Structures are given as structure tokens and as C-alpha cells.
CSV table of C-alpha atoms in Angstrom, one decimal:
chain,number,residue,atom,x,y,z
V,1,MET,CA,-34.6,-11.2,-21.2
V,2,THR,CA,-37.1,-9.4,-18.4
V,3,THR,CA,-37.7,-6.9,-15.9
V,4,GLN,CA,-34.8,-5.9,-14.2
V,5,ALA,CA,-33.2,-2.8,-12.0
V,6,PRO,CA,-29.1,-2.3,-12.7
V,7,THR,CA,-26.8,-4.1,-9.9
V,8,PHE,CA,-23.5,-4.2,-10.0
V,9,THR,CA,-21.6,-7.3,-10.9
V,10,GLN,CA,-18.9,-6.6,-9.8
V,11,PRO,CA,-18.7,-2.5,-8.3
V,12,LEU,CA,-15.9,-0.3,-8.4
V,13,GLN,CA,-12.3,-0.7,-6.2
V,14,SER,CA,-10.4,2.1,-5.2
V,15,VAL,CA,-6.7,2.9,-7.3
V,16,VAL,CA,-3.5,3.6,-6.7
V,17,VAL,CA,-1.3,4.7,-9.2
V,18,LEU,CA,2.1,6.5,-9.8
V,19,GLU,CA,1.5,9.9,-11.2
V,20,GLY,CA,1.9,10.5,-14.8
V,21,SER,CA,1.0,6.5,-15.8
V,22,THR,CA,-2.2,5.1,-17.0
V,23,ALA,CA,-5.5,4.1,-13.7
V,24,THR,CA,-8.1,2.0,-14.4
V,25,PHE,CA,-11.4,1.5,-13.3
V,26,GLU,CA,-13.7,-1.2,-14.6
V,27,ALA,CA,-17.2,-1.8,-13.0
V,28,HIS,CA,-19.5,-5.3,-13.9
V,29,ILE,CA,-23.3,-4.2,-14.3
V,30,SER,CA,-26.6,-5.3,-15.6
V,31,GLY,CA,-30.3,-4.6,-15.7
V,32,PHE,CA,-33.1,-4.7,-18.2
V,33,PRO,CA,-34.0,-2.2,-20.1
V,34,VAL,CA,-29.4,-2.2,-20.2
V,35,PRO,CA,-29.0,0.9,-17.5
V,36,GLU,CA,-28.2,4.1,-18.8
V,37,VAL,CA,-25.0,4.6,-17.5
V,38,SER,CA,-22.1,8.1,-16.2
V,39,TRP,CA,-18.9,8.8,-14.5
V,40,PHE,CA,-18.6,11.6,-11.5
V,41,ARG,CA,-16.0,12.4,-9.7
V,42,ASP,CA,-16.2,14.2,-6.1
V,43,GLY,CA,-20.4,14.3,-7.6
V,44,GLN,CA,-19.8,16.4,-10.7
V,45,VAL,CA,-20.0,14.9,-14.2
V,46,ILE,CA,-17.2,13.6,-15.8
V,47,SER,CA,-16.7,14.4,-19.9
V,48,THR,CA,-13.3,14.4,-21.4
V,49,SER,CA,-13.4,18.4,-21.2
V,50,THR,CA,-13.7,17.8,-17.8
V,51,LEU,CA,-10.7,15.1,-17.8
V,52,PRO,CA,-8.6,15.5,-21.4
V,53,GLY,CA,-7.6,12.2,-22.4
V,54,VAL,CA,-10.0,10.0,-20.4
V,55,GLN,CA,-11.5,7.0,-22.3
V,56,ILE,CA,-14.9,5.9,-21.2
V,57,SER,CA,-16.1,2.6,-22.9
V,58,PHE,CA,-19.7,0.9,-22.4
V,59,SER,CA,-20.8,-2.4,-23.4
V,60,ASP,CA,-21.5,-6.0,-22.8
V,61,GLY,CA,-22.0,-5.2,-19.7
V,62,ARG,CA,-18.2,-3.7,-18.7
V,63,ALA,CA,-17.9,-0.3,-17.7
V,64,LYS,CA,-14.7,1.1,-17.8
V,65,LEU,CA,-13.2,5.1,-17.6
V,66,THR,CA,-9.5,5.2,-18.1
V,67,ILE,CA,-7.1,8.0,-17.8
V,68,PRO,CA,-4.3,7.9,-19.6
V,69,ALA,CA,-2.3,10.1,-17.4
V,70,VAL,CA,-3.2,10.4,-14.6
V,71,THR,CA,-2.1,13.7,-12.7
V,72,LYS,CA,-2.0,14.6,-8.9
V,73,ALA,CA,-5.3,16.5,-9.4
V,74,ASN,CA,-7.2,13.9,-10.7
V,75,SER,CA,-7.0,12.3,-7.0
V,76,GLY,CA,-10.7,11.9,-5.5
V,77,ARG,CA,-14.2,9.4,-5.5
V,78,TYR,CA,-15.1,8.5,-8.7
V,79,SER,CA,-19.1,6.8,-9.2
V,80,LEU,CA,-20.6,5.1,-11.5
V,81,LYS,CA,-24.2,5.2,-12.0
V,82,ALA,CA,-26.5,3.3,-13.5
V,83,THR,CA,-30.2,3.9,-13.8
V,84,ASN,CA,-33.3,2.6,-15.7
V,85,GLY,CA,-36.6,2.4,-16.1
V,86,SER,CA,-36.7,-0.1,-12.5
V,87,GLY,CA,-34.2,1.8,-10.8
V,88,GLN,CA,-30.3,3.1,-9.8
V,89,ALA,CA,-26.9,1.7,-8.8
V,90,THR,CA,-24.4,3.3,-7.8
V,91,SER,CA,-20.7,3.0,-7.0
V,92,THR,CA,-17.7,5.1,-5.7
V,93,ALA,CA,-14.0,4.5,-5.9
V,94,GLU,CA,-11.7,6.7,-5.2
V,95,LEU,CA,-8.5,7.3,-7.6
V,96,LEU,CA,-5.6,7.7,-5.3
V,97,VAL,CA,-2.2,8.9,-7.4
V,98,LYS,CA,1.0,8.7,-5.9
V,99,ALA,CA,4.2,10.7,-6.5
V,100,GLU,CA,7.2,9.2,-7.5
V,101,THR,CA,9.9,9.4,-5.0
V,102,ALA,CA,13.3,7.1,-3.9
V,103,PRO,CA,15.5,7.8,-1.4
V,104,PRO,CA,19.2,9.3,-1.5
V,105,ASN,CA,21.4,6.1,-3.0
V,106,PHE,CA,25.0,6.5,-3.2
V,107,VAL,CA,25.2,4.6,-6.5
V,108,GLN,CA,28.9,5.8,-5.9
V,109,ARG,CA,30.3,6.2,-2.4
V,110,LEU,CA,33.6,8.1,-1.6
V,111,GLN,CA,36.2,5.9,-1.7
V,112,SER,CA,39.5,6.7,0.9
V,113,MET,CA,43.1,7.4,-0.6
V,114,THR,CA,46.4,8.3,-0.1
V,115,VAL,CA,47.9,11.2,-2.2
V,116,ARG,CA,51.4,13.1,-2.8
V,117,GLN,CA,52.5,16.7,-1.2
V,118,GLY,CA,51.1,18.4,-4.7
V,119,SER,CA,48.8,16.4,-6.4
V,120,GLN,CA,44.9,16.9,-7.0
V,121,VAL,CA,42.5,15.1,-5.5
V,122,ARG,CA,38.9,14.6,-6.7
V,123,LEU,CA,36.7,13.0,-4.3
V,124,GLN,CA,33.8,12.2,-5.9
V,125,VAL,CA,30.1,10.8,-5.1
V,126,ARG,CA,26.8,10.0,-7.4
V,127,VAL,CA,24.2,10.3,-5.5
V,128,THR,CA,20.5,9.8,-7.5
V,129,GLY,CA,16.9,10.5,-5.4
V,130,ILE,CA,13.4,12.0,-6.7
V,131,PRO,CA,13.5,14.8,-4.8
V,132,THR,CA,16.7,15.5,-5.3
V,133,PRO,CA,18.7,15.2,-2.6
V,134,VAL,CA,20.5,18.4,-0.8
V,135,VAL,CA,23.6,16.7,-0.9
V,136,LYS,CA,26.5,18.2,1.7
V,137,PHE,CA,30.5,18.0,1.5
V,138,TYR,CA,32.2,17.6,5.4
V,139,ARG,CA,35.6,17.4,6.2
V,140,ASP,CA,36.3,16.0,10.2
V,141,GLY,CA,32.9,16.7,10.7
V,142,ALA,CA,32.5,19.8,9.9
V,143,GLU,CA,30.9,21.6,6.3
V,144,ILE,CA,33.4,22.5,3.7
V,145,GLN,CA,31.0,25.8,2.3
V,146,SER,CA,33.9,26.0,0.0
V,147,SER,CA,36.3,28.9,0.0
V,148,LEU,CA,39.4,28.9,-1.6
V,149,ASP,CA,41.2,25.1,-2.8
V,150,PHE,CA,37.6,23.4,-2.1
V,151,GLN,CA,35.6,23.8,-5.1
V,152,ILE,CA,32.5,21.9,-5.4
V,153,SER,CA,30.6,21.3,-8.6
V,154,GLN,CA,28.0,19.1,-9.9
V,155,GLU,CA,27.4,17.5,-12.8
V,156,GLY,CA,24.5,15.7,-13.1
V,157,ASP,CA,24.1,12.9,-10.0
V,158,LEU,CA,27.7,13.7,-9.7
V,159,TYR,CA,29.3,15.6,-6.5
V,160,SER,CA,33.1,16.5,-6.8
V,161,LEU,CA,34.9,18.4,-4.4
V,162,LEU,CA,38.3,19.8,-5.3
V,163,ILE,CA,41.2,19.8,-3.9
V,164,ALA,CA,44.2,21.9,-6.8
V,165,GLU,CA,46.9,20.7,-4.8
V,166,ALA,CA,47.1,18.6,-2.3
V,167,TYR,CA,48.6,20.3,0.9
V,168,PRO,CA,49.5,17.7,4.4
V,169,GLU,CA,46.4,19.3,6.0
V,170,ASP,CA,44.4,18.4,3.9
V,171,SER,CA,44.5,14.8,5.2
V,172,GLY,CA,41.1,13.7,7.2
V,173,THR,CA,37.9,11.8,7.6
V,174,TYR,CA,35.8,13.1,4.6
V,175,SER,CA,32.3,13.0,4.2
V,176,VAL,CA,29.9,13.4,2.2
V,177,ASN,CA,25.5,13.0,3.1
V,178,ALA,CA,22.6,13.0,0.7
V,179,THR,CA,18.8,13.7,2.4
V,180,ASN,CA,15.4,14.7,1.3
V,181,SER,CA,11.8,14.4,2.1
V,182,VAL,CA,11.6,10.3,2.2
V,183,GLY,CA,15.7,9.4,3.7
V,184,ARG,CA,18.8,10.6,4.3
V,185,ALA,CA,22.6,8.5,3.4
V,186,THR,CA,26.0,9.4,4.0
V,187,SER,CA,29.0,8.7,2.8
V,188,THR,CA,32.6,9.0,4.5
V,189,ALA,CA,35.9,8.9,3.3
V,190,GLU,CA,40.1,8.7,4.8
V,191,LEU,CA,42.3,11.6,3.0
V,192,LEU,CA,46.2,11.1,3.9
V,193,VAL,CA,48.1,13.9,2.3
V,194,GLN,CA,51.8,12.5,2.3
V,195,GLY,CA,54.2,15.1,2.4
V,196,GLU,CA,57.1,15.5,0.5
V,197,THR,CA,61.5,16.1,2.0
R,1,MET,CA,-7.4,5.7,10.6
R,2,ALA,CA,-3.8,5.2,11.9
R,3,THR,CA,-1.3,5.2,8.7
R,4,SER,CA,1.7,3.1,9.7
R,5,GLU,CA,5.1,4.0,9.4
R,6,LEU,CA,8.2,1.8,8.6
R,7,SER,CA,11.8,2.6,7.9
R,8,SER,CA,14.7,0.4,6.5
R,9,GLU,CA,18.2,1.0,7.3
R,10,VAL,CA,22.0,0.1,6.5
R,11,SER,CA,24.8,1.2,8.1
R,12,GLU,CA,28.4,-0.1,7.0
R,13,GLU,CA,31.6,0.0,8.6
R,14,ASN,CA,34.6,-1.0,6.3
R,15,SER,CA,38.0,-1.8,8.5
R,16,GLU,CA,40.0,-2.6,6.0
R,17,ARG,CA,40.1,1.2,3.5
R,18,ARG,CA,38.8,2.6,6.9
R,19,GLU,CA,35.4,4.2,5.1
R,20,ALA,CA,31.4,4.3,6.9
R,21,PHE,CA,28.0,4.5,5.4
R,22,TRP,CA,24.7,4.7,7.0
R,23,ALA,CA,21.8,5.4,5.2
R,24,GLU,CA,17.9,5.5,6.8
R,25,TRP,CA,15.0,5.8,4.9
R,26,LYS,CA,10.6,6.0,5.0
R,27,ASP,CA,10.1,2.1,2.7
R,28,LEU,CA,6.7,1.4,3.0
R,29,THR,CA,3.6,3.2,4.1
R,30,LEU,CA,0.4,1.6,5.2
R,31,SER,CA,-3.2,4.0,5.6
R,32,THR,CA,-6.5,3.5,6.2
R,33,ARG,CA,-8.9,5.1,3.5
R,34,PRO,CA,-12.7,5.9,4.7
R,35,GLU,CA,-15.4,3.3,4.3
R,36,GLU,CA,-17.0,5.9,2.2
R,37,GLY,CA,-14.3,5.9,-0.1
R,38,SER,CA,-15.3,3.0,-2.2
R,39,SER,CA,-19.1,2.0,-1.1
R,40,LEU,CA,-22.4,0.9,-3.6
R,41,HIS,CA,-26.2,2.2,-2.9
R,42,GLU,CA,-28.8,0.6,-5.5
R,43,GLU,CA,-32.2,1.0,-5.4
R,44,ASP,CA,-35.3,-1.4,-6.8
R,45,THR,CA,-38.4,0.8,-6.6
R,46,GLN,CA,-40.1,-2.0,-8.2
R,47,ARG,CA,-39.7,-3.9,-6.1
R,48,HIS,CA,-38.8,-1.9,-3.4
R,49,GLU,CA,-35.4,-2.9,-2.0
R,50,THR,CA,-32.3,-0.9,-1.0
R,51,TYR,CA,-28.6,-2.1,0.1
R,52,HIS,CA,-25.8,-0.3,1.1
R,53,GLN,CA,-22.8,-0.7,1.9
R,54,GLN,CA,-19.2,1.0,2.7
R,55,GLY,CA,-16.4,-0.8,3.2
R,56,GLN,CA,-12.3,0.5,4.7
R,57,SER,CA,-9.7,-0.2,2.4
R,58,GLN,CA,-5.3,-0.1,3.5
R,59,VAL,CA,-3.3,1.4,0.7
R,60,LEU,CA,0.1,0.6,0.4
R,61,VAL,CA,3.0,2.7,-1.0
R,62,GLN,CA,6.5,1.7,-1.4
R,63,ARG,CA,9.7,3.2,-2.1
R,64,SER,CA,13.7,2.2,-2.6
R,65,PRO,CA,17.1,3.8,-2.8
R,66,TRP,CA,17.3,1.9,-6.4
R,67,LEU,CA,14.6,3.9,-7.5
R,68,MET,CA,11.4,1.3,-7.3
R,69,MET,CA,8.4,1.9,-6.3
R,70,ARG,CA,5.3,-0.5,-5.0
R,71,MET,CA,1.9,0.2,-4.6
R,72,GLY,CA,-1.6,-1.3,-4.0
R,73,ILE,CA,-4.1,-2.1,-1.9
R,74,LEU,CA,-3.5,-4.8,0.7
R,75,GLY,CA,-5.2,-7.2,0.4
R,76,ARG,CA,-5.0,-7.1,-3.8
R,77,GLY,CA,-2.6,-6.2,-6.2
R,78,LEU,CA,0.7,-5.1,-6.0
R,79,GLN,CA,2.4,-2.3,-9.0
R,80,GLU,CA,5.5,-1.4,-9.5
R,81,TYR,CA,6.8,0.6,-11.3
R,82,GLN,CA,11.0,1.7,-12.3
R,83,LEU,CA,11.5,5.4,-10.9
R,84,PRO,CA,12.1,7.9,-12.9
R,85,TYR,CA,8.6,6.8,-14.5
R,86,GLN,CA,9.4,6.2,-18.7
R,87,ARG,CA,6.2,6.7,-20.3
R,88,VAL,CA,5.6,5.1,-23.4
R,89,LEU,CA,3.8,7.0,-26.7
C,1,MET,CA,40.7,-12.4,-5.1
C,2,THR,CA,41.4,-9.0,-3.8
C,3,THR,CA,39.4,-9.0,-0.1
C,4,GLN,CA,37.0,-6.5,0.1
C,5,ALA,CA,34.7,-5.9,3.4
C,6,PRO,CA,30.9,-6.9,3.1
C,7,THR,CA,28.3,-4.8,1.3
C,8,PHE,CA,25.2,-5.1,0.5
C,9,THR,CA,24.7,-4.4,-3.2
C,10,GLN,CA,20.7,-5.0,-2.5
C,11,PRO,CA,19.6,-3.9,0.8
C,12,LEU,CA,16.4,-5.4,2.8
C,13,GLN,CA,13.5,-4.0,2.6
C,14,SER,CA,10.3,-4.0,4.4
C,15,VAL,CA,7.3,-6.4,4.4
C,16,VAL,CA,3.5,-6.0,5.4
C,17,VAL,CA,2.1,-8.7,5.1
C,18,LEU,CA,-1.6,-10.7,5.8
C,19,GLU,CA,-1.9,-13.2,9.2
C,20,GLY,CA,-1.6,-16.6,7.5
C,21,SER,CA,0.5,-15.7,4.7
C,22,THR,CA,4.8,-16.0,3.9
C,23,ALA,CA,7.3,-13.3,4.5
C,24,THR,CA,10.7,-12.9,2.5
C,25,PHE,CA,13.0,-10.8,3.7
C,26,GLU,CA,15.7,-10.7,1.2
C,27,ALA,CA,18.8,-9.5,0.3
C,28,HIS,CA,22.2,-8.9,-1.9
C,29,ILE,CA,25.5,-8.7,-0.4
C,30,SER,CA,29.5,-9.7,-1.7
C,31,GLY,CA,32.7,-9.3,-0.1
C,32,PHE,CA,35.8,-11.3,0.1
C,33,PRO,CA,36.0,-13.7,2.0
C,34,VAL,CA,32.3,-14.1,1.6
C,35,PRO,CA,31.3,-12.7,4.7
C,36,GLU,CA,30.0,-14.4,7.8
C,37,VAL,CA,25.8,-13.4,8.2
C,38,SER,CA,23.0,-14.1,10.6
C,39,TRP,CA,19.9,-12.6,11.1
C,40,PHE,CA,18.2,-10.8,14.2
C,41,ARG,CA,14.6,-10.3,15.1
C,42,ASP,CA,14.8,-7.5,17.4
C,43,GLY,CA,18.2,-7.7,18.3
C,44,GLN,CA,17.8,-10.6,19.1
C,45,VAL,CA,19.2,-13.7,16.8
C,46,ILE,CA,16.9,-15.4,15.1
C,47,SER,CA,17.2,-19.7,14.3
C,48,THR,CA,13.8,-22.5,14.0
C,49,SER,CA,13.8,-22.0,17.3
C,50,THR,CA,12.6,-18.8,17.9
C,51,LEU,CA,10.7,-18.5,15.5
C,52,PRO,CA,9.4,-22.1,13.8
C,53,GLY,CA,9.6,-22.1,10.3
C,54,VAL,CA,12.1,-19.8,8.4
C,55,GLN,CA,13.6,-21.1,6.4
C,56,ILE,CA,17.3,-18.8,5.5
C,57,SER,CA,19.6,-19.5,3.0
C,58,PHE,CA,22.9,-17.9,1.5
C,59,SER,CA,24.1,-18.6,-1.5
C,60,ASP,CA,25.7,-16.8,-4.9
C,61,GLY,CA,25.3,-13.3,-2.5
C,62,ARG,CA,21.7,-14.3,-2.2
C,63,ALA,CA,20.6,-13.7,1.7
C,64,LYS,CA,16.9,-14.8,2.4
C,65,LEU,CA,14.8,-16.0,5.5
C,66,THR,CA,11.1,-16.3,4.8
C,67,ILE,CA,8.8,-17.7,7.3
C,68,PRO,CA,6.4,-20.0,6.0
C,69,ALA,CA,3.0,-18.9,7.3
C,70,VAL,CA,3.2,-15.1,9.5
C,71,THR,CA,1.6,-15.1,12.8
C,72,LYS,CA,0.8,-11.4,14.2
C,73,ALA,CA,3.3,-11.4,16.8
C,74,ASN,CA,6.3,-12.5,13.8
C,75,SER,CA,5.5,-8.3,13.7
C,76,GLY,CA,9.4,-6.3,14.3
C,77,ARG,CA,12.6,-5.1,13.1
C,78,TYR,CA,14.7,-8.0,11.5
C,79,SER,CA,18.2,-7.2,10.3
C,80,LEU,CA,20.7,-9.3,8.8
C,81,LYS,CA,24.3,-8.4,9.9
C,82,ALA,CA,27.5,-9.3,7.3
C,83,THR,CA,30.9,-9.8,9.1
C,84,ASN,CA,34.4,-10.7,7.1
C,85,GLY,CA,37.8,-9.8,8.0
C,86,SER,CA,37.8,-6.4,6.0
C,87,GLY,CA,34.9,-5.2,8.3
C,88,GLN,CA,31.1,-5.4,8.8
C,89,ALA,CA,27.1,-4.0,7.8
C,90,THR,CA,24.2,-4.6,8.4
C,91,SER,CA,20.9,-4.3,6.8
C,92,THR,CA,17.7,-3.2,9.3
C,93,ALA,CA,14.3,-3.3,8.1
C,94,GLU,CA,10.7,-4.2,9.5
C,95,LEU,CA,7.8,-6.7,9.6
C,96,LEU,CA,4.0,-5.3,9.3
C,97,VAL,CA,1.7,-8.3,9.7
C,98,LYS,CA,-1.3,-7.3,9.3
C,99,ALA,CA,-5.3,-9.2,10.0
C,100,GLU,CA,-7.2,-10.6,6.8
C,101,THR,CA,-10.5,-8.7,7.3
C,102,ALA,CA,-13.7,-8.4,5.1
C,103,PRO,CA,-16.8,-6.1,5.4
C,104,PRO,CA,-20.1,-7.1,5.8
C,105,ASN,CA,-21.8,-8.4,2.3
C,106,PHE,CA,-25.2,-9.5,1.9
C,107,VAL,CA,-24.5,-12.4,-0.4
C,108,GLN,CA,-28.7,-13.0,0.0
C,109,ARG,CA,-30.4,-9.9,0.6
C,110,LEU,CA,-33.3,-9.2,1.6
C,111,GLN,CA,-36.1,-9.7,-0.1
C,112,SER,CA,-39.5,-8.4,-0.4
C,113,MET,CA,-43.4,-9.8,0.2
C,114,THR,CA,-46.9,-10.1,0.3
C,115,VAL,CA,-48.8,-12.5,3.2
C,116,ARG,CA,-52.3,-13.5,3.3
C,117,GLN,CA,-52.2,-12.7,7.2
C,118,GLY,CA,-51.9,-15.4,9.7
C,119,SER,CA,-49.0,-16.9,8.2
C,120,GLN,CA,-45.3,-18.0,8.7
C,121,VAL,CA,-42.8,-15.0,7.5
C,122,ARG,CA,-39.2,-15.7,7.2
C,123,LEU,CA,-37.7,-13.2,6.5
C,124,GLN,CA,-33.8,-14.3,5.5
C,125,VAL,CA,-30.2,-12.9,4.9
C,126,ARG,CA,-27.1,-14.6,4.2
C,127,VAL,CA,-23.5,-12.3,5.6
C,128,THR,CA,-19.7,-12.1,5.3
C,129,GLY,CA,-17.2,-9.9,7.0
C,130,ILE,CA,-14.0,-10.5,8.8
C,131,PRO,CA,-14.0,-10.0,11.9
C,132,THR,CA,-18.0,-10.9,12.1
C,133,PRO,CA,-20.1,-8.7,10.9
C,134,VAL,CA,-23.0,-7.9,14.3
C,135,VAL,CA,-26.7,-8.4,12.4
C,136,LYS,CA,-29.7,-6.3,14.1
C,137,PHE,CA,-32.9,-6.5,13.0
C,138,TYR,CA,-35.7,-3.3,11.9
C,139,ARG,CA,-38.9,-2.8,11.1
C,140,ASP,CA,-39.6,1.3,9.9
C,141,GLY,CA,-36.4,2.3,11.6
C,142,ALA,CA,-36.6,0.5,15.0
C,143,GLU,CA,-34.9,-2.7,16.1
C,144,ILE,CA,-36.6,-5.8,16.5
C,145,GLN,CA,-35.1,-8.2,18.8
C,146,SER,CA,-35.4,-12.0,19.5
C,147,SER,CA,-38.1,-13.2,20.9
C,148,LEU,CA,-41.7,-15.2,21.4
C,149,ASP,CA,-43.0,-13.9,17.7
C,150,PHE,CA,-40.2,-12.6,15.9
C,151,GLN,CA,-37.9,-15.9,15.8
C,152,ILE,CA,-33.9,-14.8,15.0
C,153,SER,CA,-31.8,-16.9,14.2
C,154,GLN,CA,-28.2,-17.7,12.4
C,155,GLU,CA,-27.1,-21.0,10.6
C,156,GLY,CA,-23.4,-19.9,9.7
C,157,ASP,CA,-24.3,-16.9,7.9
C,158,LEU,CA,-28.0,-17.2,7.1
C,159,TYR,CA,-30.1,-14.8,9.7
C,160,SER,CA,-33.7,-15.2,9.2
C,161,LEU,CA,-36.6,-13.7,11.0
C,162,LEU,CA,-38.9,-15.3,11.4
C,163,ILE,CA,-42.4,-14.3,12.7
C,164,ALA,CA,-44.4,-17.2,13.9
C,165,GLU,CA,-47.5,-15.2,13.0
C,166,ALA,CA,-47.5,-12.6,10.5
C,167,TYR,CA,-50.9,-9.5,10.4
C,168,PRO,CA,-51.2,-6.6,8.8
C,169,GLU,CA,-49.5,-4.4,11.9
C,170,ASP,CA,-46.7,-6.2,10.9
C,171,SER,CA,-46.3,-4.9,7.8
C,172,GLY,CA,-43.8,-2.7,6.5
C,173,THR,CA,-39.8,-1.6,5.4
C,174,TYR,CA,-37.6,-4.6,6.9
C,175,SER,CA,-34.4,-3.7,7.8
C,176,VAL,CA,-30.3,-6.2,8.2
C,177,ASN,CA,-28.4,-3.9,9.3
C,178,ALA,CA,-24.7,-6.1,8.8
C,179,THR,CA,-21.7,-4.2,10.8
C,180,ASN,CA,-18.2,-4.9,11.9
C,181,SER,CA,-14.9,-3.0,12.6
C,182,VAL,CA,-13.8,-2.9,8.1
C,183,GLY,CA,-17.3,-1.3,7.2
C,184,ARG,CA,-21.1,-1.8,7.6
C,185,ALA,CA,-23.6,-2.6,4.9
C,186,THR,CA,-27.8,-2.4,4.9
C,187,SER,CA,-30.7,-4.3,3.0
C,188,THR,CA,-33.9,-3.2,2.9
C,189,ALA,CA,-37.3,-4.6,1.5
C,190,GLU,CA,-40.9,-3.8,2.1
C,191,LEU,CA,-43.3,-6.1,3.6
C,192,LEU,CA,-46.9,-6.3,3.3
C,193,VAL,CA,-49.0,-8.5,5.5
C,194,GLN,CA,-52.7,-8.8,4.0
C,195,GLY,CA,-56.0,-9.5,5.6
C,196,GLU,CA,-59.4,-9.6,5.3
C,197,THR,CA,-62.5,-8.7,8.3
C,198,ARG,CA,-65.5,-7.7,8.5
């Protein structure tokens, strides 16, 4: 073809990806003779010893680097350097790794109910959230840190308050709260215990 | 530079069944990455020509209660994930 | 059917859009009788008199508000209210409208050349950027501003420096720097004017 220093047809572009998913830096390059190409992260050279699982390819002009699954550790700016007789070109971009997160969700909300005195009552919610939300049960607005007949338990994302035998005085407004780093949610229901005789 | 933090709320009142429900969450987050963050320089030592560029990019992270994330580079693509992320191999 | 209070099965989401783009707010609501719904921006109700363009629909539990070509004024808290006999629900989300920017780009970079003293010299570059980059010329690190002998002029995105009468003194490393709020680019190339004198 002809003598020509390497130029990026398409420089590297920053990427934002979910932790544990694949990232990918791609560039189109030119130059003659074909440029010796190499990748760096935050200044230092990259290899599969440096970053187990890296797939780096250089052919037909296209210059890929793939991270099968990414980690927060992997975050930082990546460079592609192309050198030959006529000069050199460098393209830098950022790999930005986002942790997975999702606000508290009530897949199942508290629902109010009327029960007879003496009945067992189960007040249960289903709650998701990354990180796991802290959930708290409340009665007439004060926290039930659960002594005696008001056993709070968990079974996966199912949290249930148990009242073994229902007393009339137990009637009130129950509320469960769910919070974590990126949001909060609150579900309230009324319980009426209908006496006897 | 100036990250923007956008929130979403829901608030619900059931009068029939005497139930109430509310929710506030960090929905969308927008940030600025420095110009050094993505740059190029090329030296043509045969012709004595050099080129340099640097440019900001704004990144978008969006999340939800139904475990769907959305992220990417403002002005380019978005990518959507279903949480918890469920790899393939 | 059993009555049921309005409830968002999927609430609104916040929306970041580029100026001049379509913004879509949508939500899913259930309840019986099917709720009465209404949309608000910053607490004021929305109509085509406040948001010229807005479309808005509600069928089979699908609520939806779309702004055809958002402006930066359109940014704010958007809410959807739903009421029926059994109760009421509101969902609130933000719109952030953003400017399309683009960092400076040299479509045409300065090129290196030799010339014979006395001749005219045009050193040109083509630069793009939003907002419009500031463009400045340099010889050996000192800035050249337009004059008789060195006339700078832009024609669209084409910027030229015109040295009316090159001399060996004007040899050097020439630089164009384009700058704007979101990025910088600089292009350099060498100019050698020769000569001959007894």
C-alpha cells in the first residue's frame, strides 16, 4: 500500500457494565506496516496473567479486548497503543463497573384482616432488594422487636409475623418497613381481633 | 463534575381495605467523567504531525424495584440487565 | 367484578433525555372500577396548553405520557394520579433533559509542508464540536492572532490561517487548539519555508 503511521479509524469508547458481565473494548486502526499493538490498564501492560480470561484479538484492522466476566477490580482506564516505523497512536477509555442494586420491593404487601379471638394470625410480606433490605415490623407505629407471642421469622424473601393466639388488644395498624442503600418501602394493614362472649 | 441524582416515589392509599403503602428510590444516576477519561494521541514521526483529543462522557445508571437495571453512555447506547445477573456458561 | 383500589403494578420511572428527543413516561395501574387518571408536572396538571405536543393515553392499564421533542424547560417532577371509589395512588418520577454536546474534533488536521520563501501559505483545519469550539493558532507555543500578514478566517467549520508572504522566519511547529465545555483537541504540523540569498 504505502508508508503510513498508525491512526485510529475508531478510537476506544468508554463502557459501563454490570459486575459479572462481559465488557468489550474495540478499535479500528490503520498504518503501514501494520502496527505492533498492545493494551494497558491504568498505565501497565495487560495479559491473561494480569487479567485471567482476557480475550484479546488483532486482525483485519479490528482490535478487540473482551473481559468475559468483569469485576469491580477491573475498573479503570484502558489504552490501546499502536506503534510502527512511522509513529505511534494511543487511545484511552474507561471501563466503569457498576455493582448490582435494586430498591426494596414488596412482591407481597401486608393485607388487613378480621379474625376471631383465639385465632392464629400470620402477617406476611415478600420482599426483594439488592443488597438485602433490612425489614422491620411495626404495630401502631412502634417497632416490634418481638418478645413473647409476636414471633418474627424469615423464609427466603418471606418475612412473617406470627401471633399464636389472637387477643382483642392485638387489633391495630401493622406496618412493615423495608430499606437498603438505594431506597425504602412501607406496607401497612389493619388487624381487627373480634372478641367472644 | 455534577452527578445528578433523580428519584422516584409511589404513594398509595386504600380506603376500602384500610391499607397504605409508599416507596422512595434512587432511580437514575448521571455522572460526568473527566476528559482524560477518554482520549487519543497520535504521533506521525515521519511527517512531524501530532494530534490530541480528550472528551468528557456522561454515564447513566438506572435501577428499579422490579430488578431491572439500565446503564450506558449518554448519547450512545443503553444496556439492560435482569437482576440478579444470571450468567451463561 | 370485585372492587379494588388503584395500585401501580409498575410505577413510573425517571427519564433522562437529550434535548430535541422523545420523552416517554409510562406506568401500569390496576383497580376497579378502572381508575380515573391524571398527569401533573411540578404539581400543576398537564394539558396541551401547558405542554404543547404531549400525547397521553390509558388503555388496558397502560398509562403513558410522551413529549415529542423535549426542551430543557420540560425538566421536572412528573406525577400520575389514579383514583377510584376504593382509594387512590400517585406515582412520581423526574425528567432530566440534557444538551447534546460533542467534544472538539479535527475532521481535517493541519498538514506539514515545505515552501519557497515569498509564496502564499494557507494552513487549514476542519473542526467540529457542540458547543462550537474556540479555535486558536500557534507557532512555537506563541499564539497568532489575525493580522494583515497572518489572516485567520473561518468558513463554516473550516478554519484557515493565511500567511500572505512566507519567509524562513515563519518556519516552525504550528498548532491549532480547539476547545469547548466538554473537550479539547489540538493538531500540530511542521512548516518550513526555504529561501535562497546572497
